[PDB]
Design a protein around this ligand. Structure first.
Ligand code: GDP
Ligand code: GDP
Ligand code: GDP
Ligand code: GDP
Ligand code: GDP
Ligand code: GDP
Ligand code: MG
Ligand code: MG
Ligand code: MG
Ligand code: MG
Ligand code: MG
Ligand code: MG
Lengths: 132, 133, 132, 133, 132, 132
């Protein structure tokens, strides 16, 4: 049934003026905003916590640098099967119809993050909205 | 050559959410034409039960009928090349972005649109909603 | 407060695949469909009744011919101040932002009709939906 | 040169009607940038009353406050050339197609968006919603 | 009143990925492309001729610089009352519903040029499409 | 993996006023125009070369006729993995989310051509843009 998931809108969305386009796609599939924060520049520690699973990868530092290179928005969305459904909406740069498939063409500059599972959603919401 | 007609229902949730034109527009943009169309402020329960006759022994049957009479519906006959399968693909499902249900719906009952799933289904459904053959 | 008005979607809208675009503009301003009929070809008598105020004008017959040259949809819309508001949405070919202003460029092939007053709305609804 | 900041509220009716992104998108497309933004599941009555202080003696004051706390709101500070008047023009009114209110609203209370109407108003409203100057 | 007019899509439209959005607004109003050229970087001389009337203004040189700062597209559009109608579609940064009204917020970076009169359209078409 | 690919916008796109819609989908995926030509009516020889591989098929002549039945635009697009990505964007009439999937419903009148491989892109670019 009802789930909550964490979405980040990435600095490339701001640079390319695609913020509303992305949020609109999620809004049109009937998901609701439960919490939202705007960061002119996200604190690097939050970014590093968010991507901690990748801390050993060669791209870790470079990806973190990208993620602090402009604003981000962190959003908690709520709706039926929200985690999987918003993950599907995000898609990938190979899949037309999805956010990444229609709008992105890079492995790193890919516009949006959505939690990939129940456990990561719980964790990511606590990173960005520790108040709850 | 491959011209067909199919039956589409715009469901009550489309009216509630103001997505009627959005749904019709996706079909229009794929080059399918309206042949017949009726607006129902409330569809007769009898038509709904015949439409979903194949589901009559399913647990969800009565609740789905209740939903389908909870608000207006539009019944439309569309015409074009391979209309039945093409409009079914346009309809899609709530798991497939790019489709009507995939982009716009998030429930397996409140899913905005019905489209006939076969030549047999289309003949039958068109007869139900547009008996004036 | 609440009013009802009559809209015709004209044959040029069908020809140019702008039916949903036009209906969408009205739907987005929060007006509701109360009645609707699709005519593969409108009976000429209905068209002549609809435009009876113009029966003496030089363009009368030609306009009627246009209006039976393809399908039309007749719709009764309901909402606050519906008559004036939908009239404003229709606009004219000189006014960007409006249906005619954005999408039409002809005196006759202008996509949509909307009732111009309380009296004509009453009359036009009775022409297209005599049942009520 | 002519850079300004202005305060925008996305009202509860925008959430009810799923028009939040549509409204924000129109401002984004005009090349204005978000400087600050807060989501309120329910805005404090006190902030709403200060925001509409100039209307406090009007007959519609209490009802408008009730509406403004009936659902979520988003408060946003936008920045750009001539932002105050430009975003006010984007806001428009329910009589003017091409604008947010003109295209999307049909009520003088439930009208989707507020934008500051002057430099004085903007300073005051930004202070109310983003006191952390 | 069939007419032809000259449109430039400016470098800011390319920078902001608004080329199709702009062309679409003209397309939806039923104006037809008669000829079109893409310039990765327009020859400065063409720009100087195009804005010749402004050669005495203080902004001339800076405006020319902007106009060669990225690609442009030059288009001849044809349709009824095309000069006036496409001029109106262009609008200004103060008028929502128009191209500049919805999309631009600068006096120089304003996305599109459209001929403002019969004489200037003739002149501008001769500049960008001399083969004519 | 920066690449260039050749796109044709076909006469049905002009007939149906879908030119900007099609170009917009490619623009939104962040691909850049490198060169572009508008043909009021393409020289038949260019069309015959373009579809040379089909010269033995029964549909060759009729397809060529269609391709000169109205204007076309020839475009060289540049971007990461452009050939494959724009090919995927084109899609087919069975796959919603793609250009053909959302907008076309015919085997011949299918709105757009995009190069299907490295070799064909090289070849097709040489046909429409020999100056290259
Ligand atoms: N292989 C590779 N991947 C990268 C690089 N930079 C960023 N990424 C990807 O960026 C992603 C960041 O995670 P997330 O925001 O959830 O995007 P997602 O994992 O693709 O859904 C990781 O999956 C990385 O694979 C890079 O240099 N190389
Ligand atoms: N599994 C399941 N399906 C339901 C329920 N309520 C409604 N439905 C489905 O809602 C659908 C209505 O959409 P329809 O027009 O028939 O197209 P379809 O969903 O692709 O078959 C039916 O297929 C029903 O199976 C339910 O409680 N459970
Ligand atoms: N002057 C003129 N007007 C025409 C001609 N053909 C159609 N029209 C216009 O078409 C309109 C039909 O009325 P309606 O559907 O309500 O459009 P509207 O009156 O412009 O809002 C009339 O107002 C006529 O002025 C023509 O040949 N000459
Ligand atoms: N005249 C009138 N106005 C109302 C009523 N209820 C709410 N409003 C208006 O709703 C508006 C709220 O929008 P606001 O953010 O202030 O922008 P504005 O409408 O342009 O002033 C206020 O201006 C109020 O005047 C009412 O009953 N009567
Ligand atoms: N006043 C002023 N004008 C400028 C500036 N930069 C460019 N312009 C002019 O603004 C015009 C841009 O619009 P244009 O394409 O000519 O169409 P127009 O707005 O109808 O004149 C150009 O003629 C430029 O020369 C500036 O900084 N100040
Ligand atoms: N089987 C078949 N093919 C056709 C017909 N008409 C055109 N075609 C071919 O369909 C192709 C149109 O798509 P194209 O631009 O080549 O890209 P493609 O779909 O990947 O091959 C052309 O190569 C035409 O020669 C037809 O009636 N039948
Ligand atoms: Mg992710
Ligand atoms: Mg179905
Ligand atoms: Mg009228
Ligand atoms: Mg206001
Ligand atoms: Mg100009
Ligand atoms: Mg191809």
């Amino acid at each position: 049934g009802l789930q909550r998931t964490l979405v980040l809108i990435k600095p490339d969305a701001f640079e390319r003026s695609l913020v509303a386009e992305i949020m609109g796609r999620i809004e049109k599939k009937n998901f609701k905003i439960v919490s939202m924060k705007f960061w002119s520049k996200a604190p690097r520690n939050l970014i590093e916590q968010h991507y901690k699973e990748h801390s050993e990868q060669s791209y870790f530092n470079d990806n973190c640098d990208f993620m602090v290179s402009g604003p981000i928005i962190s959003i908690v969305y709520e709706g039926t099967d929200a985690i999987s459904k918003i993950r599907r909406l995000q898609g990938n740069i190979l899949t037309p119809g999805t956010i990444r498939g229609d709008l992105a063409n890079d492995i790193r500059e890919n516009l949006i993050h959505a939690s990939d599972s129940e456990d990561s959603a719980v964790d990511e919401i606590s990173i960005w909205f520790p108040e709850t």
